[PDB]
Design a protein around this ligand. Sequence first.
Ligand SMILES: C[C@H](OP(=O)(O)OP(=O)(O)OP(=O)(O)OC[C@H]1O[C@@H](n2cnc3c(N)ncnc32)[C@H](O)[C@@H]1O)c1ccccc1[N+](=O)[O-]
Length: 248
Amino acid sequence: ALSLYEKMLHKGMIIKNSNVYEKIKEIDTIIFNKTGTLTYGTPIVTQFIGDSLSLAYAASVEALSSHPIAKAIVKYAKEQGVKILEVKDFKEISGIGVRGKISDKIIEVKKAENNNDIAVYINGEPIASFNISDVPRPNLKDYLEKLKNEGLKIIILSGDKEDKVKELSKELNIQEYYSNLSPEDKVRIIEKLKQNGNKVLMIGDGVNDAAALALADVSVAMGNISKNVADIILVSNDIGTLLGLIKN
Ligand SMILES: C[C@H](OP(=O)(O)OP(=O)(O)OP(=O)(O)OC[C@H]1O[C@@H](n2cnc3c(N)ncnc32)[C@H](O)[C@@H]1O)c1ccccc1[N+](=O)[O-]
């Protein structure tokens, strides 16, 4: 025989406190933080509008960053045959975009307004754009089974726009989702849910959900260290494990 700790570990789960076992039997609500749980959390370019010079200019600035956006753009550009050019006065204004200088021209890359995600400026003039997406995880949910495993209420939280969340949502038979949320919004939703009856299990990663996870009745964090908050760490990185955990 092994400890119950040893048995959970063998299954793909690290139990950060032995008190979680009794706590889960009471759970009535499952909340997914979209990015990194229902998706791989890996951005990919789905469309570029502009010509090959603009593409080279934007790529050559993004190369000096480590942002996941930067890496995707640079990856796409080399696949199109772009050669990376020498940049100066680089600057990555955290939380907005990036910038640099080439052949006397000033190049900025940042968030775009209407129907695109990212925009490229040359000396103040907008001349090209990108659309960027995540990838949904292979399997899917016998989410019915989740809605069978008990009478479980299921909810999706996302920072993305209404039609990207709604698409994924309808894709998977989940009618309750909230789009466009700030980190502080998610905290407000969890507080209201607890304040009127519900016992909440929440799955997230390590980003704009640290505070939300700390507030839930039972927290689950992805393996992708000192995972601080969570009751349970899914080293498996496979959502099927806990899916199995739910039923007990
Ligand atoms: C990262 C991503 O999206 P996210 O999570 O929303 O972005 P975030 O990590 O919160 O970045 P912040 O909130 O610090 O930057 C604010 C805004 O300035 C722009 N921006 C920021 N940095 C840059 C840059 N180096 N170059 C161009 N634009 C930028 C950019 O438009 C950004 O929205 C992502 C990550 C994982 C999976 C899937 C995806 N995905 O989107 O598919």
